[PDB]
Design a protein around this ligand. Structure first.
Ligand SMILES: [Cu+2]
Ligand SMILES: [Cu+2]
Ligand SMILES: [Cu+2]
Ligand SMILES: [Cu+2]
Ligand SMILES: [Cu+2]
Ligand SMILES: [Cu+2]
Ligand SMILES: [Cu+2]
Ligand SMILES: [Cu+2]
Ligand SMILES: [Cu+2]
Ligand SMILES: [O]
Lengths: 281, 278, 277
């Protein structure tokens, strides 16, 4: 898909918090297309995003971002009078920025990386009940020259669920051998977990690729993660291992048993998966 | 900026273990002056420090540090007769070393970082009564050319508290927009936590800040941590996000909800906090 | 000294058996099983065929982290690659050197501190097979890697170190100045914080910085949860001297209840000063 360009476009989008089946809550880019996870927000460093947000719930909701620049007005908390009342609208405003030398000669970390947004005022003032119900979603902020993927898949460990799904309902994601798949992995709630993928590995750093033969970042297939931790990577599907149904799961042993498990379906060029007996789950 | 010198002085300090109000145990720089956490001890790589310790409790205590060089005699553990009787005194010596190449020709990591000290002898032989009641403190060992801060603030997640404080008592931490703020973050006791800061982000490396455009240290705003973990960072306060009461909190949902929160009170240059009730 | 560049096809026989005391483990010969299992060491490019035998009365299997295996070597009941009671199976592991793709991007190497474990006993994620000790280490070395005087594996399995009864180590001995490798794996149900007295290491691939432009953190305390694996190499007693150098999980209760051990660093004349158990 090429590579990211340099940023600096004032983007704007519409966001709504809606009720979902089963008492669940979610964000969507249009009324009635709310999902869990929320819609993937993607940005290039420099970009500015106005988020026009409406609350269709009977309770106040908010919209709070990790890792992006925001004045306190866009804090998204009761503490800075920045929530959205029932039936209310409010425009939030996020900025990103590039790395660069400061006047004291110290490097200013840019805004790039794998981030998230969630609610901060439902249930409690730290968003506990809203986060549990599914008011969360991913934010990617690229830097110029970042390799771009063929696909992007978000995997939130929210307590003992994957993306609030029922135990052992995945989700599963598909690809084809060689694809540049990207994974965003976020964690929410009470518990710590350990994210693990069969047959694939990545570098523990911003992009999940090594920069080169002098990138000392370690190569893992298992990452521990806690509430609100976010990381991402990109892998080449089946690189060095082939097609097949490739397990991902939480490696905390009671958590894969209770069903924090899903499948990375990496397919041959003809769309088949060898040995994928769908009844092996 | 104005950085940290090279090291290699011999330094000396007096530290006491005391009871404070209501079952509290703590280290101080002089008597009566005990604090939780204990006093910040700061060095530059290669400095030797001679801690002249005195136990003022009616039970044994020790002084044990992370990451610095000490010889086995200054473990601060009962298991090798390093603890201190009630009323006793003992000098613990910690050393620091610069980075450098070795005998076999590999690079030997400097003793620089964000470290800590704690008791190892109260309640149990791993300091479980002593860690739980406040007998811990921060340690920073600066390299050469380390950027120096305007202020330093220690945040310790000691099981379910920040600095053995009551629930929902901060601490709160003040700065002006533009101040170079260093944060010493230590976890202790029983729970993993995940450290969070509103509006501010830092590098997951030694300094908390990147070396330049080839430093691949991840930039994060949320860090999982477990007992005896120590990291730290420098951020430019309200840089790119402005003045206001910026929350920091354990992002474990019940933990924040149960009071593991405090406010980073950041000022416009006139000493006021937009949107906050001072 | 230094590790070579890989490329051999290496064969080995592997056995799952019951141990005394009702546990389970892997060995290289029959009656020689161990918890953890034996250390498997590879160079980047090395292929290893694992001639594997289930001597247990239930399906066991072998599943590896890090390495390149085809879905046929997956080790899961899910992909029908577990081994029935009494059966044999060859699991094949490959490794790859790093290198730049036609992509232009940089492909990471198989090198690392890895581990194998059972995926089919107890449950279909090997929870009962890991619990009773069916686990063990792997070190894939990159061309030129430093090689040590010793390697020791410390597995945090729930609240046991190497499935050992509480407060019984294991202790490992060394002489001042030795180069000592530690493989640290965690398994099971709990998070942990692995800590060593008197010693520190780099939080990167090898546990040692490349030099003064390696920005890696230096630590002596690392939080790890089920299936985490890492390693390092420390110079024994470096700058700190001989002694009984304690290592433990740093969750207070976990240390209190026997997740402790010792790193016994001898003076060259074999004395460990002031040590008396
Ligand atoms: Cu928050
Ligand atoms: Cu989990
Ligand atoms: Cu948050
Ligand atoms: Cu200790
Ligand atoms: Cu917490
Ligand atoms: Cu300690
Ligand atoms: Cu698995
Ligand atoms: Cu533990
Ligand atoms: Cu596994
Ligand atoms: O696994």
């Amino acid at each position: 898909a090429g590579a990211a360009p340099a940023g600096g476009e004032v983007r704007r989008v519409t966001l709504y918090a809606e009720r979902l089946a089963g008492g669940q809550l979610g964000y969507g880019l249009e009324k009635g297309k709310a999902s869990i996870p929320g819609p993937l927000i993607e940005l290039n460093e420099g970009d500015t995003l106005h988020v026009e947000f409406e609350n269709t719930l009977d309770v106040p909701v908010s919209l709070h971002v990790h890792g992006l620049d925001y004045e306190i007005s866009s804090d998204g908390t009761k503490q800075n009078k920045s929530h959205v009342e029932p039936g209310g609208t409010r425009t939030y405003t996020w900025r990103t920025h590039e790395p660069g030398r400061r006047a004291d000669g110290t490097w200013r970390a840019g805004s790039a990386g794998y981030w998230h947004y969630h609610d901060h005022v439902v249930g409690t003032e730290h968003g506990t009940g809203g986060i549990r119900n599914g008011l969360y979603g991913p934010v990617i902020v690229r830097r110029k020259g970042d390799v771009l993927p063929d696909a992007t898949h978000t995997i939130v460990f929210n307590d003992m669920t994957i993306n609030n799904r029922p135990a052992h309902t995945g989700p599963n994601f598909e690809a084809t051998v060689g694809d540049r798949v990207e994974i965003v992995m976020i964690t929410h709630g009470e518990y710590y977990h350990t994210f693990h993928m069969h047959g694939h590995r990545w570098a523990d750093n911003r992009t999940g690729m090594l920069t080169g033969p002098d990138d000392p970042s370690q190569v893992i297939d298992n990452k521990i993660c806690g509430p609100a931790d976010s990381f991402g990577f990109q892998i080449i599907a089946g690189e060095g291992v082939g097609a097949g149904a490739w397990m991902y799961h939480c490696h905390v042993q009671s958590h894969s048993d209770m069903g924090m498990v899903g499948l990375f379906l990496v397919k041959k060029p003809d769309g088949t998966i060898p040995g994928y007996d769908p009844q092996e789950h």
